[PDB]
Amino acid sequence: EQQVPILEKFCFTPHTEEGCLSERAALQEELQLCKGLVQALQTKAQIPRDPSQQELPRLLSAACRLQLNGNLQLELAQVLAQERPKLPEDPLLSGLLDSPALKACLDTAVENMPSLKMKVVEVLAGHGHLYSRIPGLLSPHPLLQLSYTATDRHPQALEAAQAELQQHDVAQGQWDPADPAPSALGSADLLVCNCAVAALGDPASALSNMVAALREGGFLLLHTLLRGHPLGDIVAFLTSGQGILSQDAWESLFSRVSLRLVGLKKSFYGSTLFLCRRPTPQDSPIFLPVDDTSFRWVESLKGILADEDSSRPVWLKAINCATSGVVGLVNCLRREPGGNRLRCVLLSNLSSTSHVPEVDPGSAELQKVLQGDLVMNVYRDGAWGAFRHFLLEEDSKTGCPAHKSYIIAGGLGGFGLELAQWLIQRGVQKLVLTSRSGIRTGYQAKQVRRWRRQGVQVQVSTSNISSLEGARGLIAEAAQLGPVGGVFNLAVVLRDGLLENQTPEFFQDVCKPKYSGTLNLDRVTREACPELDYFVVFSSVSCGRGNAGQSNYGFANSAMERICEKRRHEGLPGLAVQWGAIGDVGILVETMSTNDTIVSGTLPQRMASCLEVLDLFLNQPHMVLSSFVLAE
């Protein structure tokens, strides 16, 4: 019966995060217990619910048992070797793998792929078990194809997992990281290794051979435990394995093998996800500002990317506009010809208090960004990072007071009429629907006639929000009916086409109702709408994910999202909703059809689902949300 959409929040995510998982009391308690069981040792049942029933506490207690009589010094080899393959499921030894930290690293890798494909190799999968996590974490990507190979030194180490491996199209191989990689595993896009449990052996040699297996620009994801931290020291004590190094040692090792560090997730107890990258021979970068409002820079970019012969990296710089939509622009152009040449920098501070770093050609900061060579480089309030998607949690209902006015920009549109209907039946008695040319269809006129016959005061306005004057006039109209309780920007103009077929004027057209419109709506509601409860813009997966031939559209949407973020930061209402394909009504169904037409591995979301999801979203504290329905 009902569709089940995937719901996510779109958050700015620092490259470096520390103290992670500190809010997980179940982990805090378990860590305390383990700390006790080692201080005891040195000095001398249903699903595990209490922190003492977990794998590592169990092992430690069994080592106290031996410590009493049978002697751990003699039996440790058989107990450790016994419970070894089960230890990676300990909550602490896999906290980061279970957290969104893993997803954040994987998505960073995917984002920096030149195409929607990734060749993956897992080292020491027999105890790493990352093959049972990564494919599932990336399966929501409707287009991404993975080529995954699980490898290990001892061919039998992956025997008990032959079923799941083969059944989920994961290839198997033999590789001791001590040696060089089989040539077949070469030119890998991503090498992963969970050596929190797995015997890494000599890490210097191991890392050297891993890098060699990566392509230039390829990524290494390493999960491990740090010396000088509690969990690392505890696991080390049980070792009497080798491969448990301090962070300084790790970073020295990365330098020694040329690995560039570009990501770092550290838990409060010292478990760590290193995201490293093999360098690409730095060709002289090109630097193009995109802050020019005339979008003249579009013509410049046309010329640059027209040069098919060149491999010059193209860096788009947005340093004088926090509400730039460069991120959305890039997500689209990356899917267009020469898109792999693209990177970007975006200075987007939410606080005017915050310091702006200098990223002119020749700065330490800019050179540091270049060495990383990441596609997405967003500076925000003291931290470098990028917007990432994360699984929204579960969570009341939406009712509107009869005396408040509600505005829908683009209200006579497909989604707009359905939104008006939904708002009404949630109590709305005062509606203002805007349109550049007023009513134009019998369908539109009919719904308005109905709503009026029901008693709903429905005004149809032509006050163009793309202008500050027209905007100001619009809220005046709504005010004449009652205090503006909410605004909903559903206005859109399309000027699709590859960038080679784009113009600055087309970009201006597309940005008029979305970018300029939402700016003016932000300004006037701040001034004259003190009872505004809702400030909702409708964005798209075209912005949040990217879509060839819609770069201007991605830009406009992305800019709206930035505005919403600033608004929420200042306590004002604000919400961008990245919609996937929408069935029943709207532009898409006009070309064409509701159900049947699979759209890039996703399905048009039925309006029933859409409104149900919108209800959930309107009652969230998050700035940017996403909804789409996966096909198959």
Ligand X SMILES: NC(=O)C1=CN([C@@H]2O[C@H](COP(=O)(O)OP(=O)(O)OC[C@H]3O[C@@H](n4cnc5c(N)ncnc54)[C@H](OP(=O)(O)O)[C@@H]3O)[C@@H](O)[C@H]2O)C=CC1
Residue 466 touches which of Cl ion, ligand X, ligand 4XN, none (CB < 5 to 8 A by kind)? ligand X
Out of 19, 70, 114, 228, point to the residue binding Cl ion (CB under 5 A): 114
Binding mask 335-374 for Cl ion (x = CB under 5 A): -----x----------------------------------
Of 57-65, 88-96, 452-460, 488-496, which part binds ligand X (CB under 6 A)?
A: 488-496
411 is in an annotated binding site: yes
Both tokens assigned to 39: 């201080």
415 is in an annotated binding site: yes
- Footprint on residues 336-395 left by ligand X (CB under 6 A): none
Are the C-beta atoms of residues 504 and 294 closer than 8 Å to each other?
yes
Of 134-142, 158-166, 302-310, 470-478, which part binds ligand 4XN (CB under 6 A)?
A: 134-142
Out of 194, 323, 466, 518, point to the residue binding ligand X (CB under 6 A): 466
Out of 582, 613, 616, 625, point to the residue binding ligand X (CB under 6 A): 582
H-state helical runs in 334-466? 364-372, 414-424, 442-453
Per 3-state DSSP, the chain is made up of helix, strand and coil in percentages (nearest 5) of 40, 20, 35
Can you state the angle between helices 25-43 and 230-239, rounded to 10 degrees?
40
542 counts as binding ligand 4XN under rule CB under 6 A: yes
Which helix (H) or strand (E) segment holds residue 390: the answer is strand 383-391
Report the C-alpha gap between 241 and 244 in whole angstroms.
Answer: 7
Both tokens assigned to 254: 């990365």
- Footprint on residues 443-502 left by ligand 4XN (CB under 6 A): 494
Q: Whose Cβ is closer to ligand 4XN: residue 90's or residue 561's?
A: 561
CB of 607 to ligand X, least distance (A): 10
Both tokens assigned to 108: 């960073």
CB of 348 to Cl ion, least distance (A): 22
618 counts as binding ligand X under rule CB under 6 A: no
Strand partners, 10: 389
11 counts as binding ligand 4XN under rule CB under 6 A: no
Both tokens assigned to 388: 């990432």
412 is in an annotated binding site: yes
CA quadruple 204, 210, 216, 217: dihedral sign: negative
581 counts as binding ligand 4XN under rule CB under 6 A: yes
545 counts as binding ligand 4XN under rule CB under 6 A: yes
> Which residue from 607, 606, 577 is spatially nearest to 7, judged by alpha carbons?
577
Q: Whose Cβ is closer to ligand X: residue 125's or residue 607's?
A: 607
Single-letter amino acid, residue 254: F
419 is in an annotated binding site: yes
Residue 459 touches which of Cl ion, ligand 4XN, ligand X, none (CB < 5 to 8 A by kind)? none
Q: Whose Cβ is closer to ligand 4XN: residue 304's or residue 599's?
A: 599
The residue number whose beta carbon is nearest to ligand X equals 413
Q: What is the DSSP string of 433-450?
A: EE-SS---SHHHHHHHHH
Residue 547 touches which of ligand 4XN, Cl ion, ligand X, none (CB < 5 to 8 A by kind)? ligand 4XN
580 counts as binding ligand 4XN under rule CB under 6 A: yes
Q: What is the DSSP string of 233-292?
A: HHHHHHH-------HHHHHHHHHHTTPEEEEEEEETTSEEEEEEE--------EEEE---
Residue 114 touches which of ligand 4XN, ligand X, Cl ion, none (CB < 5 to 8 A by kind)? Cl ion
Q: Whose Cβ is closer to Cl ion: residue 220's or residue 474's?
A: 220
Of 57-65, 167-175, 411-419, 503-511, which part binds ligand X (CB under 6 A)?
A: 411-419
Report the C-alpha gap between 260 and 461 in whole angstroms.
Answer: 56
Out of 244, 491, 611, 629, point to the residue binding ligand X (CB under 6 A): 491
Residue 384 touches which of ligand 4XN, Cl ion, ligand X, none (CB < 5 to 8 A by kind)? none
CB of 335 to Cl ion, least distance (A): 12
Both tokens assigned to 592: 């064409």
Angle, CA of 387, 626 and 563, to the nearest 5°? 60
Taken as a whole, the chain contains a residue count of 632
629 counts as binding ligand X under rule CB under 6 A: no
- Footprint on residues 268-297 left by Cl ion (CB under 5 A): none
How many residues contact ligand 4XN, by CB under 6 A? 17
325 is in an annotated binding site: no
Q: Which long-range contacts (CB under 8 A, 24 or more apart) does 600-603 make?
A: 600/142, 600/143, 601/142, 601/143, 601/630, 601/631, 601/632, 602/142, 602/541, 602/628, 602/629, 602/630, 602/631, 603/3, 603/629, 603/630, 603/631
441 counts as binding ligand X under rule CB under 6 A: no
Work out the number of other CB atoms within 10 angstroms of the CB of residue 455.
10
Report the C-alpha gap between 331 and 334 in whole angstroms.
Answer: 5
136 counts as binding Cl ion under rule CB under 5 A: no
Per-residue b or e along 153-188, where b marks 16 or more CB atoms closer than 10 Å to that residue's CB = beeebbeebeeebeeeebbbbebbbeeebeeebeeb
142 counts as binding ligand 4XN under rule CB under 6 A: yes
Name where the chain breaks: residue before each gap, C-N > 2.5 Å: 44, 240, 395
The label of the residue with tokens 């149900």 reads 612
CB of 274 to ligand X, least distance (A): 37
Report the C-alpha gap between 273 and 270 in whole angstroms.
Answer: 10
Out of 222, 305, 465, 481, point to the residue binding ligand X (CB under 6 A): 465
Interface with Cl ion by CB under 5 A: which residues?
A: 114, 340
Interface with ligand X by CB under 6 A: which residues?
A: 409-410, 412-416, 434-437, 464-466, 490-493, 512-513, 517, 538, 540, 579, 581-582, 586-588
Interface with ligand 4XN by CB under 6 A: which residues?
A: 140-142, 494, 540-542, 545, 547, 580-581, 587-588, 599-600, 602, 628
- Which residue ranges make up the annotated binding site? 405-420
